[PDB]
Amino acid sequence: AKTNITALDELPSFALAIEELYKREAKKPHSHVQRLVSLSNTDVLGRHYRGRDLANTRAYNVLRMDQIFARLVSKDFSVNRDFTIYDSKYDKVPGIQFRRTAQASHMLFLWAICLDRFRMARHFWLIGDQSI
Amino acid sequence: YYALSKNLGPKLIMMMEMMKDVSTFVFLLLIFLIGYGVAAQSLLSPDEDFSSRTFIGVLFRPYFQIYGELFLDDLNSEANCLGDTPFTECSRETVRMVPFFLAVYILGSNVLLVNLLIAMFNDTYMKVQEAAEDLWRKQNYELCA
Amino acid sequence: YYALSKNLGPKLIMMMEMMKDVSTFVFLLLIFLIGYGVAAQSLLSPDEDFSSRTFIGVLFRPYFQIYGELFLDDLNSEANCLGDTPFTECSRETVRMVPFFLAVYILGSNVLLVNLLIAMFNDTYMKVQEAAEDLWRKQNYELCA
Amino acid sequence: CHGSDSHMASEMLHSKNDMFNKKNAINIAYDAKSLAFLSHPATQSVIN
Amino acid sequence: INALVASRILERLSTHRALQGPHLAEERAKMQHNAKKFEELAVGVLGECHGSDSHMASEMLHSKNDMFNKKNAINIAYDAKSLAFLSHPATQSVIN
Amino acid sequence: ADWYGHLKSVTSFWAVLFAFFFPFFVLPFINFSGAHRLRRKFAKFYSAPYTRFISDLLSHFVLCVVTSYFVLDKLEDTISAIEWILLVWFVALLLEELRQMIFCDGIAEYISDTWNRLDLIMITLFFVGFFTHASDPSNQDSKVVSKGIHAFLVVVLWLRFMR
Amino acid sequence: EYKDRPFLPAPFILLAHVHMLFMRLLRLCGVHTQEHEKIQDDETKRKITTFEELNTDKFLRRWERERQEMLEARVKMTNDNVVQAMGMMDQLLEHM
Amino acid sequence: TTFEELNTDKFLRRWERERQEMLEARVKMTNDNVVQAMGMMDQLLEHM
Ligand SMILES: CC(C)CCC[C@@H](C)[C@H]1CC[C@H]2[C@@H]3CC=C4C[C@@H](O)CC[C@]4(C)[C@H]3CC[C@]12C
Ligand SMILES: CC(C)CCC[C@@H](C)[C@H]1CC[C@H]2[C@@H]3CC=C4C[C@@H](O)CC[C@]4(C)[C@H]3CC[C@]12C
Ligand SMILES: CC(C)CCC[C@@H](C)[C@H]1CC[C@H]2[C@@H]3CC=C4C[C@@H](O)CC[C@]4(C)[C@H]3CC[C@]12C
Ligand SMILES: CC(C)CCC[C@@H](C)[C@H]1CC[C@H]2[C@@H]3CC=C4C[C@@H](O)CC[C@]4(C)[C@H]3CC[C@]12C
Ligand SMILES: CC(C)CCC[C@@H](C)[C@H]1CC[C@H]2[C@@H]3CC=C4C[C@@H](O)CC[C@]4(C)[C@H]3CC[C@]12C
Ligand SMILES: [Mg+2]
Ligand SMILES: [Mg+2]
Ligand SMILES: [Mg+2]
User: What span, in angstroms and rounded, lies between the C-alpha atoms of B131 and F109?
Assistant: 44
User: What span, in angstroms and rounded, lies between the C-alpha atoms of D15 and D3?
Assistant: 18
Residues that place a CB less than 5 A from ion ligand 6: H 5
Distances (CA, A) of A62 to A13, B72, E58, F55: 12, 78, 79, 52
User: What span, in angstroms and rounded, lies between the C-alpha atoms of C104 and B102?
Assistant: 23
Instruction: List Cβ<8 Å contacts ≥24 apart for C76-83.
Output: C78/C44, C78/C45, C79/C44, C83/B53
Please state the three-class secondary structure of C68-125 as a single string: CCCCHHHHHHHCCCCCCCCCCCCCCCHHHHHHHHHHHHHHHHHHHHHHHHHHHHHHHH
D17: three-class secondary structure by DSSP: strand
Which stretch of DSSP H or E encloses residue D27?
helix D25-31
At E10, which amino acid appears? L
Any chains having at least 3 CB pairs less than 8 A from chain A are: D, H
User: What span, in angstroms and rounded, lies between the C-alpha atoms of C53 and C60?
Assistant: 10
Which residue's CA is the nearest one to ligand 1's atom 23? C100
* Ligand 3 atom closest to residue B100's alpha carbon, by position in its atom list: 28
Burial-class residue E51 by CB neighbours within 10 Å (0-12, 13-18, 19+): exposed
Q: Is the dihedral of CA G23, G27, G33, G39 positive or negative?
A: positive
* Nearest by Cα to B36 from F69, F151, F62, F126: F151
Which residue's CA is the nearest one to ligand 3's atom 14? B99
Chain B residues with beta carbon closer than 8 angstroms to that of C72: 64, 69
Triad B36, B41, B43: Cα angle to 5°: 95
Distance in angstroms between the alpha carbons of the first and the last residue of chain D: 18
Tell me, yes or no, if B131 comes closer than 8 A to chain C by beta carbon: no
Q: Nearest CA of chain D to the CA of A28: how many Å?
A: 31
DSSP letter, residue B67: G
Distances (CA, A) of H48 to E70, G84, G86, H42: 76, 18, 16, 10
E71: three-class secondary structure by DSSP: strand
Interface touch D38/B144, C-beta < 8 Å:
no
The answer to whether A74 and D14 have CB atoms below 8 angstroms apart is no
Triad D31, D32, D34: Cα angle to 5°: 115
The answer to whether C31 and B2 have CB atoms below 8 angstroms apart is no
* Nearest by Cα to F90 from F49, F133, F129: F129
* Residue environment code for E59-96, b if the CB has 16+ CB neighbours within 10 A, otherwise e: ebbeeeeeeeeeeebbebbbebebbbbbbbebbeebbe
User: What span, in angstroms and rounded, lies between the C-alpha atoms of A40 and A20?
Assistant: 19
User: What span, in angstroms and rounded, lies between the C-alpha atoms of B16 and F139?
Assistant: 55
User: What span, in angstroms and rounded, lies between the C-alpha atoms of A44 and C84?
Assistant: 78
Q: Is G43 annotated as a binding residue?
A: no
Closest residue in B to D46 (Cα–Cα): B141
Q: Nearest CA of chain D to the CA of E30: how many Å?
A: 12
Checking phi first, is residue D5 left (phi over 0); if not, alpha (psi -120 to 50) or beta? Answer: beta
E65: three-class secondary structure by DSSP: strand
Chain H residues with beta carbon closer than 8 angstroms to that of A126: 8, 12
CA of G77 to the centre of ligand 3 (A): 71
User: What span, in angstroms and rounded, lies between the C-alpha atoms of A109 and A115?
Assistant: 10
F2: three-class secondary structure by DSSP: coil
Distances (CA, A) of A25 to A55, B87, E65, F151: 18, 82, 79, 69
Distances (CA, A) of B62 to B5, B70, B104, G11: 39, 9, 12, 31
What technique solved it?
cryo-EM
User: What span, in angstroms and rounded, lies between the C-alpha atoms of B98 and E5?
Assistant: 75
Chain B residues with beta carbon closer than 8 angstroms to that of D27: 145
Which residue's CA is the nearest one to ligand 3's atom 10? B103
* Nearest by Cα to G92 from C70, F122, A39, H44: H44
Which residue's CA is the nearest one to ligand 2's atom 25? B97
Taking 3-state DSSP, the helix, strand and coil percentages for chain D, each rounded to the nearest 5, stand at: 60, 5, 35
User: What span, in angstroms and rounded, lies between the C-alpha atoms of E41 and D14?
Assistant: 43
* Nearest by Cα to F50 from F19, F10, F99, F13: F13
Chain H residues with beta carbon closer than 8 angstroms to that of G81: 31, 34-35, 38
Count of CB atoms situated within 10 Å of the CB of G37? 4
User: What span, in angstroms and rounded, lies between the C-alpha atoms of A125 and A108?
Assistant: 9
User: What span, in angstroms and rounded, lies between the C-alpha atoms of H20 and H15?
Assistant: 9
Distances (CA, A) of F162 to A91, F10, F61, F152: 77, 25, 10, 16
Please state the three-class secondary structure of C5-63 as a single string: CCCHHHHHHHHHHHHHHHHHHHHHHHHHHHHHHHHHHHHHCCCCCCCHHHHHHHHHHHH
CA dihedral E44, E47, E49, E52 (to 10 degrees): -130
Which stretch of DSSP H or E encloses residue F119?
helix F114-135
Tell me, yes or no, if D1 comes closer than 8 A to chain H by beta carbon: yes
Please state the three-class secondary structure of F31-97 as a single string: CCCCHHHHHHHHHHHCCCHHHHHHHHHHHHHHHHHHHHHHHHCCCCCCCCHHHHHHHHHHHHHHHHH
Rg, C-alpha atoms of chain B:
22
Given ligand 5 and candidates B87, B91, B95, B97, which is best to mutate, with the most ligand atoms within 8 Å of its CB? B97
CA dihedral B100, B104, B109, B110 (to 10 degrees): 80
User: What span, in angstroms and rounded, lies between the C-alpha atoms of F32 and C40?
Assistant: 52
D17 - beta bridge partners?
A: D23
Torsions phi, psi of G91, nearest 5? -60, -45
Rg, C-alpha atoms of chain E:
15
User: What span, in angstroms and rounded, lies between the C-alpha atoms of B34 and B41?
Assistant: 10
Please state the three-class secondary structure of chain G as a single string: CCCCCCCCCCCCHHHHHHHHHHHHHHHHHHCCCCCCCCCCCHHHHHHHHHHHHHHHHHHHHHHHHHHHCCHHHHHHHHHHHHHHHHHHHHHHHHHC
User: What span, in angstroms and rounded, lies between the C-alpha atoms of A86 and A100?
Assistant: 7
Chain F residues with beta carbon closer than 8 angstroms to that of G11: 59, 85, 88-89, 92
E65 - beta bridge partners?
A: E71
User: What span, in angstroms and rounded, lies between the C-alpha atoms of A46 and H37?
Assistant: 58
Q: Nearest CA of chain F to the CA of B140: how many Å?
A: 35
Count of CB atoms situated within 10 Å of the CB of F10? 8
Q: Is A21 annotated as a binding residue?
A: no
Instruction: List Cβ<8 Å contacts ≥24 apart for E2-6.
Output: E3/E38, E3/E39, E3/E41, E3/E42, E3/E45, E4/E38, E4/E39, E4/E42, E4/E73, E4/E76, E4/E77, E4/E80, E4/E82, E4/E85, E5/E80, E6/E34, E6/E35, E6/E38
Count of CB atoms situated within 10 Å of the CB of A69? 17
Interface touch H45/G78, C-beta < 8 Å:
no
* Nearest by Cα to F142 from F86, F77, F89: F77
Count of CB atoms situated within 10 Å of the CB of G22? 11
Q: Nearest CA of chain E to the CA of D39: how many Å?
A: 18
User: What span, in angstroms and rounded, lies between the C-alpha atoms of D45 and C85?
Assistant: 60
Beta-carbon-side half-sphere exposure of residue E13 (alpha carbons within 13 Å): 17
User: What span, in angstroms and rounded, lies between the C-alpha atoms of A68 and A113?
Assistant: 13
CA dihedral F64, F68, F70, F73 (to 10 degrees): -160
* Nearest by Cα to C140 from B54, D33, E87: E87
Question: Would you mind telling me the total number of residues written for chain G in this entry?
Answer: 96
The answer to whether C90 and C44 have CB atoms below 8 angstroms apart is no
CA of H9 to the centre of ligand 6 (A): 8
* Ligand 1 atom closest to residue C97's alpha carbon, by position in its atom list: 23
User: What span, in angstroms and rounded, lies between the C-alpha atoms of A114 and A124?
Assistant: 13
Distances (CA, A) of G3 to A73, F49, G21: 44, 5, 19
Any chains having at least 3 CB pairs less than 8 A from chain C are: B, E
User: What span, in angstroms and rounded, lies between the C-alpha atoms of F61 and A118?
Assistant: 52
Resolution at which this structure was determined, Å: 2.5
Q: Nearest CA of chain H to the CA of G93: how many Å?
A: 10
Which residue's CA is the nearest one to ligand 3's atom 25? B100
A62: three-class secondary structure by DSSP: helix
User: What span, in angstroms and rounded, lies between the C-alpha atoms of G50 and G44?
Assistant: 10
Chain E residues with beta carbon closer than 8 angstroms to that of D2: 25
Q: Is A128 annotated as a binding residue?
A: yes
* Ligand 3 atom closest to residue B96's alpha carbon, by position in its atom list: 19
At E51, which amino acid appears? G
User: What span, in angstroms and rounded, lies between the C-alpha atoms of B40 and C105?
Assistant: 25
Triad B21, B25, B27: Cα angle to 5°: 115
User: What span, in angstroms and rounded, lies between the C-alpha atoms of C9 and C83?
Assistant: 56
Interface touch G9/F56, C-beta < 8 Å:
yes
Beta strand spans in E2-95 (E): none
The answer to whether C73 and B60 have CB atoms below 8 angstroms apart is no
**Which string of DSSP letters, residue by residue, matches A21-52?**
HHHHHHTSTT-HHHHHHHHH---TT--S---H
Any chains having at least 3 CB pairs less than 8 A from chain H are: A, D, G
The answer to whether F159 and F80 have CB atoms below 8 angstroms apart is no
Tell me, yes or no, if C97 comes closer than 8 A to chain B by beta carbon: no
Which stretch of DSSP H or E encloses residue H45?
helix H23-47
Please state the three-class secondary structure of A66-101 as a single string: HHHHHHHHCCCCCCCCCHHHHCHHHCCCCCHHHHHH
Burial-class residue D4 by CB neighbours within 10 Å (0-12, 13-18, 19+): middle
The answer to whether F151 and B42 have CB atoms below 8 angstroms apart is yes
